[PDB]
Amino acid sequence: KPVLTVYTYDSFAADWGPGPVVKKAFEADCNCELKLVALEDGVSLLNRLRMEGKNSKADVVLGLDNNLLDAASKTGLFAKSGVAADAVNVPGGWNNDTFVPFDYGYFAFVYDKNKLKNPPQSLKELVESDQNWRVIYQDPRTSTPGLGLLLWMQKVYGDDAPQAWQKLAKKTVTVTKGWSEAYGLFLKGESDLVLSYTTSPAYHILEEKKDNYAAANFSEGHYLQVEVAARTAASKQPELAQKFLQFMVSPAFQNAIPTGNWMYPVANVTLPAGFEKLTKPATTLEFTPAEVAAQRQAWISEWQRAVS
Numbered sequence: 001k002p003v004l005t006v007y008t009y010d011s012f013a014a015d016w017g018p019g020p021v022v023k024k025a026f027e028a029d030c031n032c033e034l035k036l037v038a039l040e041d042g043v044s045l046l047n048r049l050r051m052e053g054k055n056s057k058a059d060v061v062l063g064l065d066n067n068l069l070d071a072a073s074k075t076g077l078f079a080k081s082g083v084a085a086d087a088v089n090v091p092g093g094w095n096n097d098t099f100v101p102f103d104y105g106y107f108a109f110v111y112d113k114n115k116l117k118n119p120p121q122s123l124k125e126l127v128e129s130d131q132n133w134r135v136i137y138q139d140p141r142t143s144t145p146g147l148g149l150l151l152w153m154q155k156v157y158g159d160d161a162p163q164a165w166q167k168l169a170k171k172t173v174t175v176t177k178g179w180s181e182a183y184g185l186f187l188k189g190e191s192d193l194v195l196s197y198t199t200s201p202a203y204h205i206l207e208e209k210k211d212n213y214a215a216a217n218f219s220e221g222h223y224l225q226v227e228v229a230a231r232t233a234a235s236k237q238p239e240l241a242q243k244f245l246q247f248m249v250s251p252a253f254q255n256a257i258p259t260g261n262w263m264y265p266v267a268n269v270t271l272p273a274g275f276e277k278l279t280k281p282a283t284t285l286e287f288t289p290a291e292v293a294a295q296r297q298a299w300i301s302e303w304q305r306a307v308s
């Protein structure tokens, strides 16, 4: 009967996402009405919450990630999770009293092997090659995968990011606010490549029995994303919010991540047959939450100037 409002992005709460599964699994156990609201894209979730303040109707924000931690905590809108750390297993480890991971992955450009014969083998080639590859990606101001690509490029080019961005802009068909639209245009054929995840091919393999889609493994390595959730300080249902966060890092939840969100679980659950066809990037790239919050505004400012 009591309601637990959870802000999240559209692909999570989608009928085909993990939402429906997690919902009934949480409600079937802990009596209450879990209300998953597909409100904004990853980065936008935070900006919207910062503007709702304590007037926000959210109890939990699901869908932020490792790159937004500093920005989120400095806001003061989140309370401690009350979730035991030992309940989580993530690459590079995880030590945080507020944000609880629920899955992780690696950003990568996906393409159709039946349509793209000689795909790029490094972010550098994709940007500098003379090939006229069509690319689509997300806005770093609204989408985590978008923010991911922004930081990925920063790792690879450093102070040369803007010049690299101008070159990438010439191969850019469009830029969407969220991943869903981006991926849809890709599947419709509007581009040769789209920024997505190393695990995206798994969706097509298991659900459509197709293995023609692939994520290009770049030699520079790939940027790591650890999605997280946290309860709000203004929540009027603290206890429930926290029972949801603990239940999140548990099997009933995690078991729906592989085929729901197409990402690697945070708990040692069994990965669906098919994931083994995927490529685990050797080298992993990541900025500290502090480094991103301190420079993301300037990097985004340079990005938009270079691609418009």
Ligand SMILES: Cc1ncc(C[n+]2csc(CCOP(=O)(O)O)c2C)c(N)n1
Binding pocket: 009, 010, 011, 040, 041, 042, 043, 044, 138, 142, 143, 144, 145, 146, 177, 178, 179, 180, 196, 197, 199, 200, 201, 203, 204, 260, 261, 262, 263
């Ligand atoms: C086929 C397929 N590949 C990958 C994923 C995972 N995924 C897609 S978008 C996203 C975060 C988006 O933040 P934002 O909405 O702001 O772009 C994640 C984790 C999926 N659901 N399906």
